[PDB]
Amino acid sequence: RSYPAIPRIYAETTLNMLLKRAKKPRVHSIDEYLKDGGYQALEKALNMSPEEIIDWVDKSTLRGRGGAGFPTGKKWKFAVQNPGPRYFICNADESEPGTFKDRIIIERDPHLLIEGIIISSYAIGANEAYIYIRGEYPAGYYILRDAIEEAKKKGFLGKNILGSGFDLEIYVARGAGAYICGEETALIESLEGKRGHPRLKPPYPVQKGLWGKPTVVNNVETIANVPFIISMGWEEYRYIGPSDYAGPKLFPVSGKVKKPGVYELPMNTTLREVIFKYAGGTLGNKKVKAVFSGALDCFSSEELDIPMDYSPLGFGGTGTVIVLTEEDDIVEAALKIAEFYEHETCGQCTPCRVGCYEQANLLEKIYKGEATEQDWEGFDFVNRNIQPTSICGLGAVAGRLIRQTLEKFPEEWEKY
Amino acid sequence: FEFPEELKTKLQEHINYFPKKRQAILLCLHEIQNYYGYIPPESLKPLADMLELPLNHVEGVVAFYDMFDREDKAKYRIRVCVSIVCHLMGTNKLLKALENILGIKPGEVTPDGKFKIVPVQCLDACSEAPVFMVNDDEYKFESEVQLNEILSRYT
Ligand SMILES: NC(=O)c1ccc[n+]([C@@H]2O[C@H](COP(=O)([O-])OP(=O)(O)OC[C@H]3O[C@@H](n4cnc5c(N)ncnc54)[C@H](O)[C@@H]3O)[C@@H](O)[C@H]2O)c1
Ligand SMILES: Cc1cc2nc3c(=O)[nH]c(=O)nc-3n(C[C@H](O)[C@H](O)[C@H](O)COP(=O)(O)O)c2cc1C
Ligand code: SF4
Ligand code: FES
Ligand code: NA
């Protein structure tokens, strides 16, 4: 059995949890997973009440790893207050620039994710679960399909799992090129066989989701923590990392570092430590100019001492670290971010549709030295006016990183 | 028009996979593009019938999703990441190497219909930048000599 080629992304851990197996760049099949005590947290979970599993996930303080940090236990609690049938969805759309943390769990330790999906589906009473994986992860899709079949053969999926009376089938859906399908309501629209257009929210999916039924959407990395919470118990989980932001976290580090890759570290690690202590510092020991938090925020060299946690002054986001050094042109970099939003707006909202397009079109003119004075003023205006009337997070942040480069690097923009 | 029996059986497998037929639309379109090297305009009506959807719904779905190509037939799609990290790490060197080897630029197809260069957004293998795919396979670009050897595997 063969899979399409995947680059061997470097992975390193100080905690040996989510990267216990995924630190090795290869598929860990079910026999190897079972040797590490795999699926034993599922066995323990099936001997617990769904309410007790929600309680432990709540007490663990686990927060959503998809970027918004919503408390997981609280999300599941909301869904179970609504009558069934309920659905569980694993969000494997991972399409934000720089964010390659989820694919290494999918490709290398698929059973860790599957075990977490089964436990999570049992906890919310969902008998149908989905993995929605982006179309540009074909290897991850085939690895998951094969691992699901392995789990079914071992009796971890299907009807009456391990004599518990709990039924579950996991379906794997593929995306087809749209970053917006990572937004949970557009993901649901895509699972329904439609274009990936975000819905007005509230209602949150826990109230009205797939086929208008209570639906929990959780990110791959969030789900991969669930077997650890059950296996170790919530108290031992709360003892990982700092007491206020407990648990392991994956940090995808790229750009101008010596050792780019995924680092599993506690959340009290600073951004400076991620770059210098772990990722080996910068290429050619050149000065750090900026860190792009995916396509969301831009941190300057004066902001490297912030913790990589979910605090107000913390790095936040998905812990995506893209390092730019002194040689990297900030305007050329801002243009690539503008191009990303131009390419990914779904077009439902007028200021988002026209603003994402104009921001990239005008920024290209500025970069190429073809912009008029009106093009410069128009660009500033457009960048500030993408968010109005937006119904999803994309319109709200399409100008964010670019505005931060204008504020933090005025001298470079001034040259253009 | 009628789908060949080898493709029809794969489409029927996807259609019967999810609880509802219409959920299989993207998997069916991926299967059609794999078989033909693009989405032939004549395939949209027989697919709509199989999914029990109106033709307009299927056409709107094909138009929305970036991976689907209704215009150019290509045996091998070379997806080149044109996003931020690969830009910083050498997308321009990868594009130059591809033009030197194949004689084509992004959006173009070789005369034999063998390769098409498709510029794409972040493929999220950024630590291995610059990134490209050749159909389902994904790689880090190192140099022209290395790229030439990779492309020689696609016959
Ligand atoms: N990983 C990636 O590829 C990627 C891409 C884009 C954005 N992001 C992140 O996504 C974030 C925005 O995501 P969002 O719009 O889903 O955020 P959100 O704050 O609206 O909600 C986050 C999650 O909590 C749930 N939720 C929130 N309030 C709730 C409530 N009152 N009751 C029940 N459920 C509730 C939502 O349904 C969702 O599941 C951004 O801040 C960004 O960091 C990540
Ligand atoms: C434009 C947009 C794209 C998103 N992309 C992703 C993504 O690729 N993966 C993900 O899990 N969440 C993504 N999210 C966040 C989801 O909507 C949602 O918050 C998340 O999947 C919930 O899981 P969590 O609570 O485990 O984080 C995106 C949000 C927006 C607004
Ligand atoms: S804000 Fe933008 S991406 Fe989100 S629904 Fe509106 S047009 Fe689509
Ligand atoms: S920017 Fe090219 S793979 Fe992410
Ligand atoms: Na997608």
Author numbering:
A (entry chain B): 2 to 417
B (entry chain A): 6 to 160
From the paper:
Complex I couples the transfer of two electrons from NADH to ubiquinone (Q) with the translocation of four protons across the membrane. Here, we show that the redox state of N1a regulates NADH oxidation in complex I by inducing a conformational change close to the NADH-binding site.
We therefore sought to lock the peptide bond in place by exchanging a nearby residue, G129E, with serine and aspartate, respectively. Structures of the oxidized G129SE and G129DE variants were refined to 2.4 and 1.9 Å resolution, respectively. The same position of the peptide bond was retained when the oxidized G129DE variant was soaked with NAD+. Thus, the nicotinamide might adopt several positions within the binding pocket of the variant. The 3.5 Å distance between Oγ of S129E and the carbonyl oxygen of E95F is longer than the 3.2 Å from the carboxylate oxygen of D129E to this position. Thus, while both mutations fixed the position of the peptide bond, the Gly/Asp exchange seemed to exert a much stronger effect than the Gly/Ser mutation.
